[PDB]
């Protein structure tokens, strides 16, 4: 029930690395995972991996394990159930194959079997 604003549209060239932000608000940032998804021109959507703002635990697909730098800050509490945090996204070996729109997605629940499911999406950032 909050916003997940991201960075702008930064376009570099292959071999480099790009940093993408994801500033949260309106919800307890520590209670829900932060997923990272992308839709490239060449495939469809592809799940990259989620990170736990509380457990500090990461799980990412083997297709993006040795490329992605994924971190979070620590929420700045606003009220008892509101906070403001940030998740960051980087990649190693960059090409024009990874060109596409990228968003972050907050988890669905806090317990059960669909805890991390990307429910609340960001806005999208266009890569190289």
């Amino acid at each position: 029930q909050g916003q997940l604003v991201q960075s702008g549209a930064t376009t570099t060239k292959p071999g480099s690395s790009v940093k993408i932000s994801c500033k949260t608000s309106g919800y307890r940032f520590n209670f829900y995972h932060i997923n990272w998804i992308r839709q490239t021109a060449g495939r469809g959507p592809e799940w990259m991996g989620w990170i736990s703002p509380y457990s500090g635990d990461k799980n990412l697909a083997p297709a993006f394990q040795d490329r992605v730098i994924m971190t979070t800050d620590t929420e700045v509490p606003v009220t008892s159930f509101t906070s403001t945090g940030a998740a960051y996204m980087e990649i190693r070996n960059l090409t024009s194959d990874d060109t596409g729109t990228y968003f972050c997605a907050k988890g669905l629940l806090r317990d059960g079997s669909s805890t991390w499911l990307p429910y609340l999406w960001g806005q999208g950032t266009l890569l190289t």
Partner: protein, 122 residues
């Protein structure tokens, strides 16, 4: 588990387990003040036991009843309550209808022992 109120910021499904931990620790200027707080402690406690009694829950920690969940109280699913909201989040959302459901539990208990009394007439 976690201790007294240990799962206050936890999901309602996790906090609902092992509720006997917040059930144990519920019960001259210094002397009068201390005796004042001792009498009040038994009054607030017996009010909850008085309520559990006239609901058929006298002795229960989890107590199912007959009153159906009116969606006017909350149109949320069971999964988006017990696996998401905390016990302090939930009853702020129900705070208004809390006095309405106390009346519903009492009539469903007086219309249960009254149907039970006719049952044992045979």
């Amino acid at each position: 588990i976690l201790g007294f109120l240990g799962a206050a910021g936890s999901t309602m499904g996790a906090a609902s387990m092992a509720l006997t931990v917040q059930a144990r620790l519920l019960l001259t200027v210094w002397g009068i003040k201390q005796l004042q707080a001792r009498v009040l402690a038994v009054e607030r406690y017996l009010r909850d036991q008085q309520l559990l009694g006239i609901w058929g829950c006298s002795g229960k920690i989890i107590c199912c009843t007959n009153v159906p969940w009116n969606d006017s109280w909350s149109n949320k699913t069971i999964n988006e309550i017990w696996d998401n909201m905390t016990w302090m989040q939930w009853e702020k959302e129900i705070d208004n209808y809390t006095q309405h459901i106390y009346t519903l539990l009492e009539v469903s208990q007086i219309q249960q022992e009254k149907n039970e009394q006719e049952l044992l007439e045979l």
